[PDB]
Amino acid sequence: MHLTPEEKSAVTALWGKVNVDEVGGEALGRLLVVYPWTQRFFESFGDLSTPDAVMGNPKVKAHGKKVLGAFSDGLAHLDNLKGTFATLSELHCDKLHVDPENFRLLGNVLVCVLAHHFGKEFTPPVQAAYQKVVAGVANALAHKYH
Amino acid sequence: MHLTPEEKSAVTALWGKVNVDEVGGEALGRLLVVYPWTQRFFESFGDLSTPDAVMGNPKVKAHGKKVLGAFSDGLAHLDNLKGTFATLSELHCDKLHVDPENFRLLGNVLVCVLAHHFGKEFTPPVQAAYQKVVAGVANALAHKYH
Amino acid sequence: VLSPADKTNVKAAWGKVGAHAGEYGAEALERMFLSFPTTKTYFPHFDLSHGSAQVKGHGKKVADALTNAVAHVDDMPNALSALSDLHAHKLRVDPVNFKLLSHCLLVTLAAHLPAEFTPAVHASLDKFLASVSTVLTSKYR
Amino acid sequence: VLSPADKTNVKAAWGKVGAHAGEYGAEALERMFLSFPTTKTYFPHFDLSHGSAQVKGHGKKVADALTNAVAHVDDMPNALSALSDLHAHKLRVDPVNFKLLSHCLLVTLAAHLPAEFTPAVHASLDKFLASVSTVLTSKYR
């Protein structure tokens, strides 16, 4: 996590404009659609057979919002991601058995989602800041794997 | 490092039995042969047209010894690889233009050479400690890239 | 493998790129240079400053090649043979870097085609770039 | 693409493995579990303790499939259709993991077939495991 002050202000300024409910649903839905193998964790979510079935699934939307919720909190502790994410890291490992590569796929999808939404506002340099952030979060979420 | 005293001792003790001369030449040569694209940095070495020509090339063998040398000295600063490879990290970036991914290919090749050499002695637990060191080394070397 | 659906998706999204391909190619490069600085090791000879003509020049070349793969979506291995040779034999770019550029291309398109960058299209474009990358790397060893 | 030399190299090397493939399968998994603990996420239902019969059995299964692949080195896609299916639609192991098992397999062969693990053979086996990996993840999406 080598976020220069200016990189941190940039992450923070944009994050101000995000509708986490919405972005959360889009990011998660899109993950399940671009990398269908990730659907392995959600067989109790019902119908994920097509893009519309995934994107509109009330369960995916609610889970996405939860995930992004935890992520937003992460953004207020950019200083201590490991600490912030420790009980979650343990849960994903020990209870959920989620391969951490999943955390990196979601980060990339999220970046595409932010680009989709902010258009020209998501400048090369803003992307570079967010790239560092999703990586830091993925790393924090994997820190307790064993 | 995130090496256990037990992991540290295993690394340390096997290393004591290593001929850097021979392992250095073999590791670099295998690299040039398994991942032919790494030859892009050694055009001046000559004929690397065949396994035989690579494995026999003295320039290769001597560069191999220089690399494992530096690696070997890094094993003495296992608690600050970052600081040990700082200058070498800048060099590689700024002068050599070596993509850090190369550091990882070599690491894996190195592990295959050790297994090759030590057979029985190179147990799963010993490989595990070595995997952590090679990753550690690669990270340290890539640390100053910008 | 790309399905009929994928093919339609790609031709459609790329269709929209039209005349901006060049500029979007340049932008994907800059994004890549900024987010994954290690990729810069391959362009020691380039002026990577903002608005660099070398980068502009290069973005166009990459875009033309992608445009050519879309035009020959049913025969990419052959349409890209030459480029596959260049990369394997001269450039010798480590394979991991293809995924990085692909990623920056997807970000660029997303940033410019909001109405078209649907989930379905996104998936199609991702499979496409993966296939291009596979072709370009096929002759490496 | 496996060259004829490669196919020869592989068949030779695997030829020497013989009645030990099962043991080598089991050893490669054990090395994978320890070196890349994230791989354990796919085996929550297994006893991953040293010498576990679940691990041994699975080691055999994997070894056997490799055998069958060496045997149909000319027609992998077809020889492994079922397995490609299973992985793409049931197991859904993330593709990054295939590279980790492949590596632990080289390490295992190296440690057991010193004379045979020459540089040229090393290169071939790698390509081979890579091809096997491509086949197993070809129907993912």
Ligand code: HEM
């Ligand atoms: C930014 C990364 C992520 C964050 C912050 C995050 C956060 C969360 C939170 C807050 C929960 C609920 C915890 C609880 O039930 O006590 C959860 C559950 C879960 N997460 Fe994650 N998550 C992330 C990534 C992922 C990814 C990428 C996957 C799978 C591809 C995943 C799989 C799951 C599953 C399967 C559950 C349990 C759902 C259920 O209740 O059945 N997570 N996550």
Ligand code: HEM
């Ligand atoms: C274990 C990781 C590595 C270590 C410790 C290492 C260390 C070294 C050292 C100590 C030098 C001497 C140069 C000087 O002081 O002027 C050197 C040079 C060099 N290294 Fe690295 N290296 C590593 C990996 C690599 C890899 C993987 C490659 C490319 C495949 C590479 C490419 C080079 C080149 C091209 C030179 C310049 C040699 C010359 O001047 O002909 N290095 N390295």
Ligand code: HEM
């Ligand atoms: C799908 C992805 C890619 C496409 C379509 C592509 C296409 C091209 C094309 C059309 C050229 C110009 C060849 C000529 O002179 O006619 C080129 C050159 C080049 N590419 Fe690739 N490429 C791709 C990926 C990469 C990646 C990922 C890298 C490194 C990060 C890379 C590094 C280079 C370099 C260094 C050159 C030479 C540029 C010069 O000296 O002018 N390429 N590529």
Ligand code: HEM
């Ligand atoms: C070298 C490539 C691989 C081959 C040839 C291979 C082969 C096999 C075979 C033969 C089976 C047993 C099918 C049956 O039960 O009838 C299997 C199952 C399985 N494989 Fe793959 N595998 C490979 C890579 C992987 C990797 C890298 C992972 C995960 C890290 C993995 C995860 C699994 C799991 C979880 C099972 C089911 C285990 C059980 O519940 O018994 N495989 N594989």
